[PDB]
Homo-oligomer: A and B are copies of this chain.
């Protein structure tokens, strides 16, 4: 059985990486593009982009360790630790040439270290909708004049005593609907059915815990990145962010300018945090065009 429907022409499969069984969905032909999902979701957030991208590239979309159908990490949930798994997975499929990387939400946290440490392995980079973990995250407000702030969940999820697991267990669907809609401009794109699918996946006990362990390691990731960022990124990079309610707006590109020498950014009006679903068509177009400036299958 599969947690999410696999697009025609794609395969659902697994690979062991450093003793951890990673799930991914793969299809297409040509140079490799790895798509990395974020919190509250799985490989499936990429299911609309995948068929289009697969016309020109080999596309792989893994589940992050502990989430979807991937085994939890055996090392830890810090960015540097998780990035090893994703880098080695990509290298299994693209040993002889650099690959492209697209990441959303905590997919950014879990890839930045392997990007900065293995720059020759990364042809082009697309990051969307989340800060790279650094001191900037300590500036986001706890509360706003309009109500709940964007990232108070960083504290909720990082809290000890299994605070988040304990409160959310038995209420996973309820919580995820609130969380998704509070970070969305276009809530309509999230059908009750789609919410059901995502909720059932992250409700698996080890996945509910894994979700929050990423946040429990966030300060460690910030400290790791303080050292890593001494080396700027040199590959062509694009950032995307939502310009509507729930989105990062200008923050995404502005932060990335501090990390990357060669970066272009777009803010998508009318879209929030969940770009692949809220603004599928324009997001897909921007990603496909940016990656197609490089070598690919015709």
Binding site for B on A (CB under 8 A): 135, 137-152, 154-156, 158-161, 163, 166-168, 171, 174-175, 178, 182, 218-219, 222
Contact = CB atoms under 8 A, between A and B. Distances in A.
Contact of A144 (B138, B143, B145): B138
A42 to B, nearest CB: 23
Nearest to A163: B178
Contacts of A140: 141-143
A219 to B, nearest CB: 6
B152 A142 contact: yes
Contact of A178 (B144, B151, B161, B174): B161
B156 A156 contact: yes
A159 B178 contact: yes
Given A166-B174, A171-B167, A178-B161, A155 B145 contact: no
A143 B147 contact: no
Contacts of A178: 159-161, 163
Return the 3 tightest CB-CB contacts between A and B, nearest first. A152-B155, A148-B155, A143-B154
Nearest to A181: B161
Contacts of A149: 142, 155
21 contacts: A138-B143, A138-B144, A138-B145, A140-B142, A141-B141, A142-B155, A143-B151, A145-B222, A148-B155, A148-B156, A149-B155, A152-B154, A152-B155, A159-B182, A160-B182, A161-B174, A161-B178, A163-B175, A166-B171, A166-B174, A167-B175
A149 B167 CA distance: 18
A143 B137 contact: yes
A119 to B, nearest CB: 28
A137 B141 CA distance: 9
Nearest to A170: B170
A158 B143 contact: yes
A222 B143 CA distance: 12
